[PDB]
Amino acid sequence: ADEAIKNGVLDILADLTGSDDVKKNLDLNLFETGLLDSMGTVQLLLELQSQFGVDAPVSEFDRKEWDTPNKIIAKVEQAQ
Numbered sequence: 001a002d003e004a005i006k007n008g009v010l011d012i013l014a015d016l017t018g019s020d021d022v023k024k025n026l027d028l029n030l031f032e033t034g035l036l037d038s039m040g041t042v043q044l045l046l047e048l049q050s051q052f053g054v055d056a057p058v059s060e061f062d063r064k065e066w067d068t069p070n071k072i073i074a075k076v077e078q079a080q
Contacts, residue, residue, distance in 0.1 A: 054079040
């Protein structure tokens with residue numbers, strides 16, 4: 001893919017949290033930071049299933065992977 005995925009993902013990330021922390025840090029707990037909770041992923045997925053048409057689960061995935069941006073940036077890259 002292009003950098004529009006790594007960027008968009010991050011962009012859609014910092015946007016999700018509504019803060020400017022993940023935009024930099026590549027290991028800023030999206031859960032331990034309170035930035036995210038769960039409902040966020042749902043949305044992110046919506047955008048992750050449009051620009052990336054990802055097929056990530058939700059029922060009960062490895063939040064650990066959806067806890068950080070990197071772990072995600074990798075999940076998005078390992079989905080395309």
